Design a protein around this ligand. Structure first.
Ligand SMILES: O=C(NC[C@@]12CCC[C@@H]1CNC2)C(=O)Nc1ccc(Cl)c(F)c1
Ligand SMILES: *[C@@H]1O[C@H](CO)[C@@H](O)[C@H](O)[C@H]1NC(C)=O
Ligand SMILES: *[C@@H]1O[C@H](CO)[C@@H](O)[C@H](O)[C@H]1NC(C)=O
Ligand SMILES: *[C@@H]1O[C@H](CO)[C@@H](O)[C@H](O)[C@H]1NC(C)=O
Ligand SMILES: *[C@@H]1O[C@H](CO)[C@@H](O)[C@H](O)[C@H]1NC(C)=O
Ligand SMILES: *[C@@H]1O[C@H](CO)[C@@H](O)[C@H](O)[C@H]1NC(C)=O
Ligand SMILES: *[C@@H]1O[C@H](CO)[C@@H](O)[C@H](O)[C@H]1NC(C)=O
Ligand SMILES: *[C@@H]1O[C@H](CO)[C@@H](O)[C@H](O)[C@H]1NC(C)=O
Ligand SMILES: *[C@@H]1O[C@H](CO)[C@@H](O)[C@H](O)[C@H]1NC(C)=O
Ligand SMILES: *[C@@H]1O[C@H](CO)[C@@H](O)[C@H](O)[C@H]1NC(C)=O
Ligand SMILES: *[C@@H]1O[C@H](CO)[C@@H](O)[C@H](O)[C@H]1NC(C)=O
Length: 339
């Protein structure tokens, strides 16, 4: 027998000890080797309830990623608590690797295998495992990158859809590549992201149809963020140690519902910390071509309020709470204590 419970997890990975890449370094000191032959027991006729929005695994991963960034991505100047911290800010090697989360003895991880599981409620197909799949701690806003894809239909996740204050996570069942480059050769901070318009608009259309299922067939409208910090109004992410801020207005217009979509981007040195601890300044971009090709596997949306007396629902790209990023991958897991 077992029961819902919280415990201190540990991590496993395939990090390389000789690698200077910061994720590899962190995992080499903070994790253990993965199990080449992991066991998974499928529970028969066992119904378990899950709540992705109240899952301590999320807080723990958040804590790891904060620790990793605090140890490997120190800015030149930190502005937190009214105090000023000046440190050395050397360029680093940066590229997220898969991190596994595992339970100690006496505990096990329950995994929901229902094809269209939305993250909350009962689950029919449950299995037990010692470790989650390899999860890359990719930090971003608006768009979820290099994540896992839904297996069947596109899934809509939210602690409470009726509450517009609750973030919506869109889980795609098909990747859409985004190609971001800061050309070698001028404005060293100028950059751009390219995206196949035909693929994107087709996916966004599918997302529209899915949202209809959850909103009584009301008309679904996309719009760019109304306000807020740059980290939220724009698609922000880290590519090779550099912070990219991309204008996604071209992605979220309802006109295309086919050529290459070119999003204007800029590399910023001064950032609002996702750890929510003030601002940070980093050194200028490294020389040469700075390029990252990522899979868009999910979208973070916020719904406009005050539309109850209309046939429209308005959705704008959002984010800013990186815990939602971890939820998008940890939704199917929960920890239980064994007898
Ligand atoms: O600052 C952040 N969040 C906090 C706010 C989002 C919600 C309200 C908070 C007020 N300031 C913005 C943030 O995510 N920053 C941030 C920084 C770098 C990257 Cl790569 C990123 F993806 C996000
Ligand atoms: C349970 O999981 C299996 C395997 O993925 C799937 O075929 C089935 O549709 C799911 N639904 C049930 C019956 O629990
Ligand atoms: C990008 O997505 C494709 C599937 O669409 C996958 O094969 C590939 O491994 C992904 N790359 C990542 C996650 O870095
Ligand atoms: C993606 O999900 C949608 C429903 O949300 C479905 O219509 C479509 O067939 C799915 N595509 C793939 C690649 O499975
Ligand atoms: C997930 O499914 C449960 C019922 O199993 C339902 O109460 C909840 O509204 C669903 N979540 C979403 C976001 O649709
Ligand atoms: C969901 O949000 C709505 C709107 O704020 C609220 O009225 C309702 O009580 C919430 N539902 C739950 C389950 O708390
Ligand atoms: C990414 O886009 C750049 C645009 O300059 C292009 O040179 C490169 O071939 C693209 N890479 C992939 C994997 O499509
Ligand atoms: C754009 O996407 C379509 C599929 O929707 C694909 O067939 C085509 O090759 C893509 N165009 C380019 C320029 O690669
Ligand atoms: C949306 O409209 C279709 C029309 O075929 C209907 O079948 C379906 O029940 C409607 N869904 C909602 C959530 O209103
Ligand atoms: C994105 O680009 C559009 C078109 O140039 C512009 O109107 C809008 O203000 C930009 N968004 C942000 C957040 O700067
Ligand atoms: C996504 O994965 C690809 C392949 O490993 C990588 O090149 C790219 O930099 C990743 N994107 C981000 C934002 O980390």
């Amino acid at each position: 027998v077992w029961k819902d419970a919280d415990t201190t997890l540990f991590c496993a990975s395939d990090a390389k000890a000789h690698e200077t890449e910061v994720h590899n370094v962190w995992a080499t000191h903070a994790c253990v080797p993965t199990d080449p032959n992991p066991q998974e027991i499928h529970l028969e006729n066992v119904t378990e309830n899950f709540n992705m929005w109240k899952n301590n695994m999320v807080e723990q991963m958040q804590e790891d990623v904060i620790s990793l960034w605090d140890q490997s991505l120190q800015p030149c100047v930190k502005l937190t608590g009214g105090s000023v911290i000046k440190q050395a800010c050397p360029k680093i090697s940066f590229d997220p690797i898969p991190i596994h989360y595992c339970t100690p003895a006496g505990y096990v991880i329950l995994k929901c295998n229902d094809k269209n599981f939305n993250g909350t409620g009962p689950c029919k197909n449950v299995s037990s495992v010692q470790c989650t799949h390899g999860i890359k701690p990719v930090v971003s806003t608006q768009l979820l990158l290099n994540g896992s894809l839904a297996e069947e239909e596109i899934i809509i996740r939210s602690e409470n859809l009726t509450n517009n204050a609750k973030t919506i996570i869109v889980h795609l069942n098909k990747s859409v590549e985004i190609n971001c480059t800061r050309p070698s050769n001028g404005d060293i901070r100028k950059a751009y992201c390219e995206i196949n318009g035909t693929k994107w608009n087709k996916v966004l259309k599918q997302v529209t149809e899915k949202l209809k299922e959850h909103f009584n067939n009301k008309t679904i409208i996309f719009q760019p963020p109304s306000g807020g910090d740059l980290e939220i109004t724009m698609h922000s992410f880290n590519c090779r140690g550099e912070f990219f801020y991309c204008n996604t207005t071209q992605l979220f217009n309802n006109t295309c519902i086919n050529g290459t979509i070119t999003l204007p981007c800029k590399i910023k040195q001064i950032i609002n910390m996702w750890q929510g601890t003030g601002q940070a300044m980093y050194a200028p971009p490294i020389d040469g071509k700075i390029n990252c090709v990522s899979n868009i596997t999910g979208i973070l949306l916020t719904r406009d309020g005050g539309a109850n007396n209309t046939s429209n629902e308005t959705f704008r790209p959002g984010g800013g709470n990186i815990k939602d990023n971890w939820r998008s991958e940890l939704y199917k897991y929960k920890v239980v204590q064994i007898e």
